[PDB]
């Protein structure tokens, strides 16, 4: 007739650390740190990402001929860019407020492309068919951006542009344009009439006048001249005007968009797989429920907080000491 | 001939959550989370707030005629802007570094309006009575800002303007000004004889030359032309120089300000009353010493860290078990 | 008390039953269930109280915004240190408490038996008890169930104490 008081022992090898002791073996434990990922990218919130692949965001948004084949989704949860992203701006230049455009486009509730100024009838007084460059040919065709067209003088005459878009849509409109800065004065006169010229773009919100900056520059690609790229948002009902005699690269396409809750841009070479996840990481989708993760902290979505520690595990059982 | 040991109980309904079990009834508890407010704005640091009611920070600081019903104060704890603060800049425009000016104005220990360039003697060669616009009505008539004046040609001639102010005070002076951008060339030629004109403003540290950008713009508030608004601080012992040949809107009043940048900007539609608190929240002032509050993320002063939890009730008594 | 039992099949806390009519390792069902439920609430409080919003981290900055870029890094690094440090201490503190909590319950079970027997059994000191009186399986179940009476076989135990 004997009774003895004790507790369960097991074969478990899970080792848990505590304040007073380290490397304590426990019969049962719960992991708090998630260290796995699917290894493939998936659709965050069930909405497909926009995958640009080789093409940069400037290239796709401007219609870079190399990545003309990219399809347009009506909605995006986030943007995937590869580490070898190239073919962004295809004519040497620099976007101003580039990062602001990239950030605003990271999450869009509705995104549709439309032709803002139809090429056939919008500019009968200018030559729209010679706006090409050798810097970014399509299959050697010596072509140019798909979303913008570059107007040149016709018949050695360049009438002043006085174009506008009323914007009678119910969603914000993203309008992009550029300014060309020829290599020398001879190129300004050969390409455009009126060596002394200005370009003005504005809305009720935005009003800015530009002037060509003509100088010989270091060669990038095979040309010295540069282009600056600008973008604005046009509020619903807010008329946008383009008044110009100078080196204005007029838009052809513009985007109607309504922005979703802010998201981010992920740079990763991980292939895209069709599945759904709670959270996206650059190494693959994570759909865990644990409070912490140790996957690279550039996550997009609601996610576990990133920690550096190798392991976080809570004890639930008793110390495993067979006897 | 017996004794019993036990703990006290009462008719308490305070519910306390613990790590192991929830909804524990205790005989005493302390609520560490403030969820009440008085519904009203009040004094912070014992100095009355500046309440704009219907005016925008831009409207008040430029002297918008609709804002004349508001009197200034020698000191501010914070600035209160309402959801109906539509009466801001009258003339269509874009106020440069507006947010930075709002931060500089968040609180001032000594603020006085000084007449920097008296109308009677400061512009003997220019007409200081014209410059009223339909975009800034007052009493049904065209008017203009009270702190700034818009100079026009006096006698079919616009002599070059060269004015300066020497800061003979012991405090920094906030000087506001602006530049007019006429809609078309004909409007500038009628308004200013020079047509080709520049505006230069500078201090010891600040030096900037501006030029009018003449272009046809979308019509805003019945006008096509735009105004740009600028501001600068003049340190004691320094001077401000205004040199211009046209298109300059020059100040009449400027402010002497001993800045206290600790405070912020509060958005609230509730009235200001008389009391003394340490932190002001948009829903209302609070009066507490507790570590946490769940009223609003945006507060000004020494208050508890905003927490999203419903309750942080800390037990002080023992478990209540009727028996 | 002094070590665990590999002979238990289902349960965390329990008793060793050695009797002339049989032997086995019968778990303490009520205490194990109360402790497990409390540990479950402990873990669920640690996991579910983390407030997660739909957010995005990581920002692209221009060459001329390096001062801001490092601030973003500073913010991320500061949050990293906080999240690492508190998480490590939280885990370590919870583990310490969990182990002490479990040890308390087993000691409580020992006391549960001790106060119930009221000097009707010999305390060994190694976490075990040796009964002085003859205890059948029904008696054993009465002890396991927490409804055992020292009077029921009190005189016999006294006689067995005299036999010492």
């Amino acid at each position: 007739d004997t009774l003895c008081i004790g507790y369960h022992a097991n074969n478990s090898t899970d080792t848990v650390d505590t304040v007073l002791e380290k490397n304590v073996t426990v019969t049962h434990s719960v992991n708090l740190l998630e260290d796995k990922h699917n290894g493939k990218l998936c659709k965050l919130r069930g909405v497909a990402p926009l995958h640009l692949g080789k093409c940069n965001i400037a290239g796709w948004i401007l219609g870079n001929p190399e990545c003309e084949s990219l399809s347009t989704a009506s909605s995006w949860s986030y943007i995937v860019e590869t580490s070898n992203s190239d073919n962004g701006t295809c004519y040497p230049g620099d976007f101003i407020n580039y990062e602001e455009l990239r950030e605003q486009l990271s999450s869009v509730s509705s995104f549709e492309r439309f032709e803002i100024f139809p090429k056939t009838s919008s500019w009968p007084n200018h030559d729209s068919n010679k706006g090409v460059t050798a810097a970014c040919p399509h299959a050697g065709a010596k072509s140019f951006y798909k979303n913008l067209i570059w107007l040149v003088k016709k018949g050695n005459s360049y009438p002043k542009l006085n174009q506008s878009y009323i914007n009678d849509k119910g969603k914000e409109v993203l309008v992009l344009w550029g300014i060309h800065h020829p290599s020398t004065t001879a190129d300004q006169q050969s390409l455009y009439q009126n060596a002394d010229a200005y370009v003005f773009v504005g809305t009720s919100r935005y009003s800015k006048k530009f002037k060509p900056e003509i100088a010989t520059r270091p060669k990038v690609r095979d040309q010295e001249g540069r282009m600056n790229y600008y973008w604005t948002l046009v509020e619903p009902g807010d008329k946008i005007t383009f008044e110009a005699t100078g080196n204005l690269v007029v838009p052809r396409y513009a985007f109607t968009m309504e922005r979703n809750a802010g998201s981010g841009i992920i740079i990763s070479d991980t292939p895209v797989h069709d599945c759904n996840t709670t959270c996206q990481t650059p190494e693959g989708a994570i759909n865990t429920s644990l409070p912490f993760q140790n996957i690279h902290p550039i996550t997009i979505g609601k996610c576990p907080k990133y920690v550096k520690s190798t392991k976080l595990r809570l004890a639930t059982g008793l110390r495993n000491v067979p006897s | 001939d017996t004794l019993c040991i036990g703990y006290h109980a009462n008719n308490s309904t305070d519910t306390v959550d613990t790590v192991l079990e929830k909804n524990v009834t205790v005989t005493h508890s302390v609520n560490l989370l403030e969820d009440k407010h008085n519904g009203k704005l009040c004094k912070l640091r014992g100095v009355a707030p500046l309440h704009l009611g219907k005016c925008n920070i831009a409207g008040w600081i430029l002297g918008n005629p609709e804002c004349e019903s508001l009197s200034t104060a020698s000191s501010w704890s914070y600035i209160v802007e309402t959801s109906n603060s539509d009466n801001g800049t009258c003339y269509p425009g874009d106020f440069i570094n507006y947010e930075e000016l709002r931060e500089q104005l968040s609180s001032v220990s000594s603020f006085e309006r000084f007449e920097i360039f008296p109308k009677t003697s400061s512009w003997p060669n220019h007409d200081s009575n014209k410059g009223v616009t339909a975009a800034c009505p007052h009493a049904g008539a065209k008017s203009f800002y009270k702190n700034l004046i818009w100079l026009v040609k006096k006698g079919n001639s616009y002599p070059k303007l060269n004015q300066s102010y020497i800061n003979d005070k012991g405090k920094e002076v906030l000087v506001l000004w602006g530049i007019h951008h006429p809609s078309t060339t004909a409007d500038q030629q009628s308004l200013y004889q020079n047509a080709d004109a520049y505006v230069f403003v500078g201090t010891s540290r600040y030096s900037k030359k501006f030029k009018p950008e003449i272009a046809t713009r979308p019509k805003v508030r019945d006008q096509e032309g735009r105004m740009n608004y600028y501001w600068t601080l003049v340190e004691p012992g320094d001077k401000i120089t205004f040199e211009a040949t046209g298109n300059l809107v020059v100040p009449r009043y400027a402010f002497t300000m001993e800045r206290n940048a600790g405070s912020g900007i509060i958005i609230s539609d509730t009235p200001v009353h008389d009391c003394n608190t340490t932190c002001q929240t948009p829903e209302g002032a609070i009066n507490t010493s507790l570590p946490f509050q769940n009223i609003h993320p945006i507060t000004i002063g020494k208050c508890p860290k905003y927490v999203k939890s419903t309750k942080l009730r800390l037990a002080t008594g023992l478990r209540n078990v009727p028996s | 008390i002094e070590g665990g039992w590999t002979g238990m099949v289902d349960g965390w806390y329990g008793y060793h039953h050695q009797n002339e009519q049989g032997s086995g390792y019968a778990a303490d069902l009520k205490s194990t269930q109360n402790a497990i439920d409390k540990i479950t609430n402990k873990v669920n409080s640690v996991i579910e109280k983390m407030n997660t919003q739909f957010t995005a981290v990581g920002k692209e900055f221009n060459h001329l915004e390096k001062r801001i870029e490092n601030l973003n890094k500073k913010v991320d690094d500061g949050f990293l240190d906080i999240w690492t440090y508190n998480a490590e201490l939280l885990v370590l503190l919870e583990n310490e408490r969990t182990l002490d909590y479990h040890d308390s319950n087993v000691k409580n079970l020992y006391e549960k038996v001790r106060n119930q027997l009221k000097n009707n059994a010999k305390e060994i000191g190694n976490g075990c008890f040796e009964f002085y009186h003859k205890c059948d399986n029904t008696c054993m179940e009465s002890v396991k169930n927490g409804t055992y009476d020292y009077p029921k076989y009190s005189e016999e135990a006294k006689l067995n104490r005299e036999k010492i």
Partner: antibody
Amino acid sequence: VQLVQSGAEVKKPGASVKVSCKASGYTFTSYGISWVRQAPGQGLEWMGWISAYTGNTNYAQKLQGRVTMTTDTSTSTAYMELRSLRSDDTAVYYCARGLLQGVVILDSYYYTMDVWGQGTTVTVS
Amino acid sequence: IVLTQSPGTLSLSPGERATLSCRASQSVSSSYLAWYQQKPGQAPRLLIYGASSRATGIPDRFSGSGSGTDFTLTISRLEPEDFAVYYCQQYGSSPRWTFGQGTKLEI
């Protein structure tokens, strides 16, 4: 895997009724067993829960004192005693697998009723 | 604790969204809510285990969501089997469950 309810019967007011639920296809003592009442129309209102592993029970506060449950783990059948039946209590009762016992519950699955029985369709008149 | 079904899907056609939602009287953890389907004449079955996820032998058309006090079922495409009464199951702090009123979809 399955839960099998006993046959239906018709009782008169004031009697007590014994309702049996046989479970199979899974370890009986890992999961609790709950009862849910469904009157004609209206909807489901919870009747009670019994822990098959520990014997712990929990009953609706407004029904306390008339509903008692036991579990026979050697036969793997749960029993419900319903005292003082009234005519408004005619309903189909369902047996369901509830919160599991003996391990830490991290998943949300086990806080739900996954397998349900056919229904005993007890009529009171 | 109680829930209000406030059904908005009393009468609708197959092929369109059934925007049914449930409101809890108090904020609850998402891990304690579940949605059940019962076809008249058959025993009930489980549809969703928690507001955030589905892990059973059911067509992918059933996908819920929700947080705090406001939870939804939002079944993406209807079918003949689909029209059946829906229930909200809420687990409390004690081992007790409570149900909402539910609603029937008229074909």
